[PDB]
Design a protein around this motif. Sequence first.
Motif, PDB file in Angstrom:
ATOM      1  N   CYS A  81      -7.458   6.682  -2.128  1.00 38.91           N
ATOM      2  CA  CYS A  81      -7.633   5.240  -2.267  1.00 38.91           C
ATOM      3  C   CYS A  81      -6.297   4.602  -2.616  1.00 38.91           C
ATOM      4  CB  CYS A  81      -8.710   4.896  -3.308  1.00 38.91           C
ATOM      5  SG  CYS A  81     -10.353   5.280  -2.648  1.00 38.91           S
ATOM      6  N   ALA A  82      -5.722   4.980  -3.763  1.00 40.30           N
ATOM      7  CA  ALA A  82      -4.480   4.383  -4.244  1.00 40.30           C
ATOM      8  C   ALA A  82      -3.349   4.526  -3.225  1.00 40.30           C
ATOM      9  CB  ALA A  82      -4.078   5.001  -5.573  1.00 40.30           C
ATOM     10  N   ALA A  83      -3.347   5.643  -2.503  1.00 36.24           N
ATOM     11  CA  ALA A  83      -2.446   5.858  -1.387  1.00 36.24           C
ATOM     12  C   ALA A  83      -2.406   4.653  -0.437  1.00 36.24           C
ATOM     13  CB  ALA A  83      -2.909   7.119  -0.661  1.00 36.24           C
ATOM     14  N   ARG A  84      -3.557   4.038  -0.139  1.00 36.27           N
ATOM     15  CA  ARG A  84      -3.617   2.846   0.702  1.00 36.27           C
ATOM     16  C   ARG A  84      -2.871   1.680   0.062  1.00 36.27           C
ATOM     17  NH1 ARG A  84      -8.091   5.146   3.402  1.00 36.27           N
ATOM     18  NH2 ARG A  84      -7.137   5.785   5.418  1.00 36.27           N
ATOM     19  N   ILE A  85      -3.035   1.509  -1.254  1.00 38.75           N
ATOM     20  CA  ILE A  85      -2.366   0.460  -2.009  1.00 38.75           C
ATOM     21  C   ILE A  85      -0.876   0.544  -1.696  1.00 38.75           C
ATOM     22  CG2 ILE A  85      -1.971  -0.549  -4.280  1.00 38.75           C
ATOM     23  CD1 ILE A  85      -4.378   0.917  -5.341  1.00 38.75           C
TER      24      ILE A  85
END
Length: 76
Positions: A20-24
Amino acid sequence: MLSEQKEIAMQVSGMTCAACAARIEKGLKRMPGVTDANVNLATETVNVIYDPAETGTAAIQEKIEKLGYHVVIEGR
């Protein structure tokens, strides 16, 4: 040479692990002045490298909000 870039590292709010945070931060990897984005959810933290001629925390928070998360800046 002319510009001098730097890394920053700080915590994020809203991540749910599982890439998820990777997308951020991958969003920030598309900001004009970034070099690299590297997520460290082992520490609920992300680091990102950018050139403070174009780019830093100023632009970053702005986009991070739109990614649908809030990032902190550890101190300062």
